[PDB]
Amino acid sequence: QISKKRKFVADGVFYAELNEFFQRELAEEGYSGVEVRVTPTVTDI
Amino acid sequence: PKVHKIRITLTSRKVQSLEKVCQELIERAKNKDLRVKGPVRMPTKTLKITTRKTPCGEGSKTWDAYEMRIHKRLIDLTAPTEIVKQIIINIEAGVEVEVTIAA
Amino acid sequence: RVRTKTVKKSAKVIIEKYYPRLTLDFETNKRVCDEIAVISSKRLRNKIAGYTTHLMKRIQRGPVRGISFK
Amino acid sequence: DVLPKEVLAEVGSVKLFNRWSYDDIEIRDISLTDYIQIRAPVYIPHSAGRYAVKRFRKANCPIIERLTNSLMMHGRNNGKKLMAVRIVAHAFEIIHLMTDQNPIQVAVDAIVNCGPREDSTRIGSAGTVRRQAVDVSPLRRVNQAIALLTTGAREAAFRNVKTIAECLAEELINAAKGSSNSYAIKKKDELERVAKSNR
Amino acid sequence: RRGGFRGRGK
Amino acid sequence: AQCESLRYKLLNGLAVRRACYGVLRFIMESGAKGCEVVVSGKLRAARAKSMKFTDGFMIHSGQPAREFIDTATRHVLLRQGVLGIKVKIMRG
Amino acid sequence: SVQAVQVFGKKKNATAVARCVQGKGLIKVNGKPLKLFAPEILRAKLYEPILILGTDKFADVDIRIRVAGGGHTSQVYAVRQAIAKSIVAYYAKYVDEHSKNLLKQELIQFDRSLLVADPRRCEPKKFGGRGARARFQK
Amino acid sequence: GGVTVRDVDAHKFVAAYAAFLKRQGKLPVPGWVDTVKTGNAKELPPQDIDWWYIRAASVARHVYLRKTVGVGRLRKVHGSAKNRGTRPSHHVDASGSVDRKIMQALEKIQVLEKDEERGGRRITQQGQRDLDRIAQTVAEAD
Amino acid sequence: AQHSVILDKATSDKLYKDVQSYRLVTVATLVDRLKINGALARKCLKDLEEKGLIRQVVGHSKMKIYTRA
Amino acid sequence: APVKFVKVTRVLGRTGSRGGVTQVRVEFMDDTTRSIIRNVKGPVRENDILVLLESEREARR
RNA sequence: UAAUUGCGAUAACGAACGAGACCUUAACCUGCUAAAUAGCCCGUAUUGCCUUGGCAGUACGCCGGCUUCUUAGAGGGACUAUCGGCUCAAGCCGAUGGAAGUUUGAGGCAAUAACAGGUCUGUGAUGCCCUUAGAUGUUCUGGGCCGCACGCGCGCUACACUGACAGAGCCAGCGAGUACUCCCUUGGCCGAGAGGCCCGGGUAAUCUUGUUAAACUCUGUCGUGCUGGGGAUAGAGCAUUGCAAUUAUUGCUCUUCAACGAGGAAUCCCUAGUAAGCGCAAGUCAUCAGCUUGCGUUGAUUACGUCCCUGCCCUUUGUACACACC
Ligand SMILES: [Mg+2]
Ligand SMILES: [Mg+2]
Ligand SMILES: [Mg+2]
Ligand SMILES: [Mg+2]
Ligand SMILES: [Mg+2]
Ligand SMILES: [Mg+2]
Ligand SMILES: [Mg+2]
């Protein structure tokens, strides 16, 4: 249970973590960006 | 069927999606003969951060200021608890929704 | 107050393409331009209409070198 | 009821400053009018005008506030118009008692007489001065006259038992005539004399 | 007292 | 995607100029109005230099440089050192 | 029904909202009377819109004003700006304009600022207002 | 006609109510007078002898104008700048005990009462009647 | 430089025969020509105001000025 | 000294090394036929009036 | 013309960057869309004054009405719309509606080719060399980076009456706040002061917060004396923070009461809400701002020019210079 103001940085770092990991892992497989959609009790990538 | 005076809160970084979200929600709700309250205009939340642009400290001293804007756009309704489940469907990416029964 | 080529090309082509249906009044030129043009900015819309209505002032009183409306 | 009993005496008559009238203006000379503005009376000098946008906007402006602005200088006295307006009004009250004439009646003659008519200009001569002794425009004449009176009052009252309330007052009456014992005249005669020599 | 170097002439 | 394709062309033995030129040609058939690749580092010498390849239109000034322009940069490791690459593409 | 008009006045950061209701000639400012709410020497800067016009023209007008934000002189400039618009709106809306036109022309010839505001604000910069830091040897 | 608190100047009124409270002359004093600093930012005690009475009366004036107020609010209302030496000045609050007890004693005089439902102290029915009576005593005194 | 804080008959006699001819009387005037202290001068203003010989023109907490009647 | 009053009729550019001096065409406002050339230090408008102690001296250009 | 911005003449024609165009923001919209974490009016209940209908007030309504203030979206108008005095044209100045037309004001981004400019001490970005178990890796104890005959820079309080001291009067904005451990903090009590104890509100237009700040205003004391201006230096006592306070971290009480009378040769910044005066918010932070980045209160003298010094741009011209007048 955290405020929205602090939440909006946590999800931004979460998106950054996904991007940086994909650069370090899937560079050979033609990586070009990602997008994350958040839903209750389940998330999609 | 007991009315619970629902209220739903919204938050997002971009602004255009939320306006059409409320635009479609108000029409999706008026046609079912539900007493609807207007889309009040919550203040925008501006946030600022100052840091040095240069990474080493050499040369002249100059700063840059990043900033960020937030909108809230609260809306409320008077309806039972089960009806709002099918009224809050078909939401797109980015916009997060939080539900409060306010019983 | 000096206008670049982007307004100039559009002003000559609109003026020579559509001369008679439009007149010296600026108010008319403002609402006429967007149906017969695709412009992405309101201020540029004002820029073109503003100069074109000044040009028709000189068209009404004699000819200008380089313009041959129909 | 809604107005004070003091101002009710003057409200019936034509609008003017409460203590003193703006009628019976001097007839002494010419070439200084059109740059001193008295056609529109003002109750208190304080006003947030728009006179600092163009060149000659200050030509059509009440004189009293200009004196108040020039009265406050030297770092410490920045932004205190509440203090300045009371001091200037008290100075006009003090000068009113030594002479039955209007305080603006004395003040106008004070400004019109302490303005230099010639000045020395700086023309380069590779280490020497080709001072051509040019004349002074009326607007610069009144602009510098105000400065001389204000700096004279500040210098005289500096480190003295007297206070600026009557320290400012005494120059106006002193300068009303050719007393020659004031600071403004001290600068004025030296400037014409050096222009006379350097003609 | 006396400086040399740089651009000086006559 | 072209940035890694250039990465692949540079990891195996191949001329830098030919690999970059191949990138420049590979851009044009897709329908891009212009493209530009910058390569910097030691061009077979002790002193370092840089090269530029450019085609089509170009923008530098306005804020459209943040969205109308897609840019990328990567680091590549060689037997003796490091070479830097920067690629910009404008899409209509 | 009841005769009333609403006006508002602004300054740099001083907002003065006013309510003009048909009354009997009563003037009160911020709760306080007109004798009190001002600095002592600037209390004069409150009476000019009344004295230049005449007390006889305030027969059946009541004004209540709330002002906040800014500074003392901003507040007094807000109230002096609000009074002119309140009186001209009440006369324009509810009575013949024979009064209104002479009130407006005479008042604006005495002072133009009664009907228009003066726009002045500050500009941010990265060294202070307009001056930079001291330089070593130019 | 009828007059109220708003109809009188605050500065001359407070002197009049201090003179009126002289005639009753009954407000307890715990001996703190002539020894307290009245504020950290301050440096000299007030010269006038009935500074405790003008201050207690002034506290009742501001509580008359506010709906709920506490010791913290009166603590910072009467604060001012302090000369810290070679450092630039700041804003610090006055002493707490003097302002707390000067209005704690004001309860038993039947001027203002507690507001425990939400906090602070508010003005009482018969308490306002004293300042109202003195309003007419001063208004037509002119 | 130093003035006198007390007023004796030698200074009292000048007042009641000279104050009828001054146009203005101020603290500066008394410290200037009477060679008296400023506090004593302010007292000289207040004791003499109530005897009914001088009238108030303007009053203030920092400086006060008096003239003839 | 018989100080005389003169009025300016036209300004002709700004001369001097630093623009302090100004060149104007003046009119004697007592004999409307006569007109000479002088130098002025401050800003000048048309129909402005200046006070001149001596007129015989004339300026360059 | 602010501009390689244009009008035009033309062995040149057509094009690509930069400027502009562009984006955010301050302005303004008595319309449309709406609003109890935003307000106003309306109706009541209802305290005191004066009865008076009245006045200063307080509470209630949750579909009583409104949105005028307030907010936030969509589109409006700003384009000089119109007009005057110049010119064929490019272009410049002023007035009326309008807050504006100086490009409305201020910003963000901002060309080719470059510097042996700075950074290996930001990076699990990096070549080569070196030490790699008597370690240059890591870690624990203590000290140091602050040590002082002296020259230099960026700043703060001052050299007083245009002042100091004592009571009273009383006006802002941008922002920040609760963990797997207490973060901004109301109210009550104790306490000279710094502080201590006890309920309670706020994951926040709801509570802190109306941040009722400073400056400033009124009424008094002091009276030109380096004095009640100025507070360096030091003694004694009382507290909070942290594992730990000595070379005291800081705060509070009493006392000690230096130099400093507008500062030499030299030298920096600046064109209207601007300079200066004064405070507030955030950062680094358990505590400490004389620092920086922003925010607000009050708000000025003189000019609307020129290339003289110190520099910049275009053309003609001279050269024994090309590491380029060092
Ligand atoms: Mg461009
Ligand atoms: Mg700044
Ligand atoms: Mg460049
Ligand atoms: Mg090591
Ligand atoms: Mg001493
Ligand atoms: Mg801090
Ligand atoms: Mg030769």
Task: State how far the alpha carbon of J12 is from the alpha carbons of D140, G47, J35, J49, in Å.
Answer: 20, 49, 14, 17
Inter-residue contact J22 to J10 (CB < 8 Å): no
Beta-carbon contacts of J31 under 8 Å, excluding residues fewer than 6 positions away, are none
Structure tokens at B24: 């479609």
In Å, how far are D120, D122, D125, D133, E2 from J20, measured between CA atoms? 11, 9, 16, 12, 39
Residues of F in contact with A20 (CB under 8 A): none
CB neighbour list of residue C57: distance below 8 Å, 6 or more residues apart: C24
Task: Inspect the interface and report whether the beta carbons of J50 and D124 lie closer than 8 Å.
Answer: no
Q: How far apart (Å, rounded) are the C-alpha atoms in residues G109 and G102?
A: 11
Q: CA of H87 vs C1' of K141, distance in Å?
A: 39
Stated as kind and residue range, the H or E segment containing D69 is helix D63-71
| CA atoms G22, G24, G25, G27: torsion sign | negative
Instruction: State the chains in contact with H (3 or more Cβ–Cβ pairs under 8 Å).
Output: G
Asked if D15 and D39 count as a contact pair (C-beta separation under 8 A), the reply is no
Cite the DSSP H helix spans in A1-45.
4-25
Q: Is the CB of F92 under 7 A from strand K?
A: no
* Angstrom distance (rounded) from CA D154 to CA D148: 10
For residue H58, give the nucleotide whose C1' atom is nearest its CA.
Answer: K168
Q: Tokens representing H31?
A: 């001996």
User: How far, in Å, are D165, H15, H79, H128, H139 from residue H57 at the CA level?
Assistant: 36, 9, 18, 13, 18
The answer to whether the beta carbons of residues J44 and D56 sit under 8 Å apart is no
Work out whether the CA dihedral H108, H109, H110, H114 comes out positive or negative: negative
> Residue D131: which of D66, D83, D195 has the closest Cα?
D195
Chain F residues closer than 8 Å to A28 by CB: 4, 8
Strand K closer than 7 A to residue H3 Cβ: yes
CA distance D21 to D47: 20
**Are G73 and G42 within 8 A, CB to CB?**
yes
J8 three-class SS:
strand
* Cβ proximity of H112 and H106 under 8 Å: yes
Crossing angle, helix G72-94 and helix G97-110, to 10 degrees?
Answer: 150
Identify all chain J residues contacting D126, using CB atoms and an 8 Å cutoff. Answer: none
Closest Cα partner for G11 from G123, G128, G130, G113? G113
CA trace torsion H5, H8, H12, H18 (10° rounding): -30
- Strands G27-29 and G61-68 turn out to be parallel
The two beta strands, F34-41 and F82-90, are antiparallel
Residue I61 CB lies within 7 Å of the nucleic strand K: yes
What whole-number distance in Å separates Cα of residue D199 and Cα of residue D132?
Answer: 6
Cβ pair J38, D135 in contact under 8 A: yes
Distance CA F72, CA F88 (A): 7
The backbone torsions φ and ψ at residue D42, rounded to the nearest 5 degrees and listed phi first, read -135, 140
Tokens of F90: 């404008």
Contact H10 G31 (CB under 8 A): no
Give the 3-state DSSP-derived string for chain B, with helices as H, strands as E and coil as C: CCECCCEEEEEECCCHHHHHHHHHHHHHHHCCCCCECCCCCCCCEEEEEEEECCCCCCCCCCEEEEEEEEECCCEEECCECCHHHHHCCCCCCCCEEEEECCC
Q: Are D117 and J53 in contact (CB under 8 A)?
A: yes
Declared resolution, Å: 3.2
Q: Do I24 and D93 touch (CB under 8 A)?
A: no
Q: G45 labelled as ligand-binding? A: no
* Whether D140 and J51 lie within 8 Å, measured CB to CB: no
The DSSP element (H or E) to which H125 belongs, if any, is helix H125-139
Verify whether the Cβ–Cβ distance D97 to I67 is below 8 Å.
yes
**Burial annotation G5-22 (CB, 10 A radius, 16+ → b, else e):** bebebbbbebbbbbebee
Which residues of C in 21-60 have their CB below 7 Å from strand K's atoms?
Answer: 26-27, 30, 41-44, 46-47, 49-51, 53-54, 58
What is the end-to-end Cα distance of chain D in Å, rounded?
A: 66
| DSSP-based three-state secondary structure for H134 | helix
- Backbone discontinuities in chain G, residue before each (C to N > 2.5 A): none
**φ, ψ of residue J52 in degrees (nearest 5):** -120, 125
Q: Which residues of chain D does I65 touch, with a Cβ-Cβ cutoff of 8 Å?
A: 93-94, 165-166
